[PDB]
Amino acid sequence: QVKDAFVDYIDNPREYLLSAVNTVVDVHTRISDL
Amino acid sequence: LALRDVAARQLANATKTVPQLRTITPRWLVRLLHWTPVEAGIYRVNQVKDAFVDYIDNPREYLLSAVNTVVDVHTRISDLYSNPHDQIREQLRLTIEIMKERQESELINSREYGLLNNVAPGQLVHTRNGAPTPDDLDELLIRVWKEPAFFLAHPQAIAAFGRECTRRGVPPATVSLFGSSFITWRGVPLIPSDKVPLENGKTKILLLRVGESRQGVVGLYQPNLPGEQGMGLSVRFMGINRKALASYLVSLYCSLAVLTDDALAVLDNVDVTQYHTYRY
Amino acid sequence: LALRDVAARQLANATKTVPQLRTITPRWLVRLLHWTPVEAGIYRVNQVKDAFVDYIDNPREYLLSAVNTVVDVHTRISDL
Amino acid sequence: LALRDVAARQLANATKTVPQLRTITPRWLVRLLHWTPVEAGIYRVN
Amino acid sequence: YSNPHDQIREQLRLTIEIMKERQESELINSREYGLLNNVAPGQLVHTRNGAPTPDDLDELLIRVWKEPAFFLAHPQAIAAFGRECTRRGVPPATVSLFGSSFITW
């Protein structure tokens, strides 16, 4: 970001960390086989 | 006043190194050994009895040993942070480095195989006065007089031998091997290894002949492994658990055989803490 | 006196058979049956009722059954 | 519990070395000498 | 029992190894031929003080000054000569022959 919009930048910019959402899908082998 | 360095640095890509592992050693012994493949994990060393020609009926069989390590990497870490460095590859690389260090230490110190425990009677020499003098290494060379390959010693023991050579006014020669310089005694190089035990300033020095053509020391490994990444080394994907941790199995199969008993000698009671006082 | 058999045998490769399983049978019935594929595990056998021509409305449905066995082999055994 | 190592080893071929003879030496003198053939077993040095 | 190793060939190989060792020992020690018994008068040197010092090997080199090829010694005698060289502060040089290192004087 430009600070207080000479041209200076802020020294503590926000860093966005990607988040993880996990789901485990359990399927019995006989169900998918049959 | 103008744009400052700390603010302009927020736009700059930092150059990131791979993680530095300080316990990595050159592992000279593994590079100096001759390696024999054992296709089914059993190495039987047949011997002539009391060298008509008869063989012994109970030859030693060497079973290759397995060392396993599980490498757990969270799937989100390898998914998110693998640019520009593969996270799984770095974890595996480092894991294999540590396992190779352990393998060298086992080639020296194992209780089943392992040079310091498979030394024959009559091949164990003792220092006359503690410090590793030229005479003690000459004794070692008496024991392995048939084409000796190299000495193996702790770097402090190599320094102590150098001090003993300096006190006697003898500069030992050096050779270049693998782009590195090594002290030699009577043309036999002194190879450093920090896996040789050193406790209370007391260590040991080994002398080896290597190879199957000669009847020397050989390393043993398993040649055809699933997921093979190196000599006797394999990496397998184990699966992912419920908490999204991916596991990898690192396996190392290795052993060591001393084919004849005059291929190895050990100098015992080496003292590395003695310093001469030069007065003139 | 010369080289003995027990000592010379230390140099010889033994011929190893696969493990013999004595409970194996020819299993003639399986070889004599006719085998019908069921693509989705359900086999409905329709029947003529009291053999105009009518069919029963509650035919038997055969559900294929599953028998599972887990085979554990240590990685070092298959490696070595 | 699963298949054990001692039982699985009954299926494995052992690698057998030739018999090791510890009294073998490099015999440097024979390799360093010059060897002269004598066709009829008699060598007369004049 | 000749799979994978020929039994006759191994027996013969080992037998020939033992005979070659005996042959080297006879080249050194035989009573008819044999270097230690076919030494001329004037070519037999004695150590001045027991141990094989540099001066004794210099005497030997006096006796065979015309293009000498090599010394032949027991490995313990080579170690004793090395100890005598170390006591005098002399490191002897080494050569490579047949892929092996040897002390030279």
Residue numbers in the entry:
A (entry chain A): 54 to 58, 77 to 105
B (entry chain A): 8 to 58, 77 to 305
C (entry chain A): 8 to 58, 77 to 105
D (entry chain A): 8 to 53
E (entry chain A): 106 to 210
Article sentences:
Prokaryotic nanocompartments, also known as encapsulins, are a recently discovered proteinaceous organelle-like compartment in prokaryotes that compartmentalize cargo enzymes. Here, we describe a novel encapsulin in the freshwater cyanobacterium Synechococcus elongatus PCC 7942.
Cryo-EM analysis was performed on purified holo-SrpI to resolve the shell structure at 2.2 Å resolution. Interestingly, the A-domain of SrpI that forms a pore at the fivefold axis is composed of residues that are positively charged, in contrast to the negatively charged fivefold axis pore of Family 1 encapsulins. The inability to resolve significant portions of the cargo density may be due to low occupancy, or conformational flexibility of the cargo, which disappears at higher resolutions when many particles are averaged together. While the cargo EM density was too weak to accurately build an atomic model of the cysteine desulfurase cargo residues, we were able to determine which shell residues likely interact with cargo density based on their proximity to the putative cargo EM density. Namely, residues F262, and Y273 are located near the suggested cargo density.
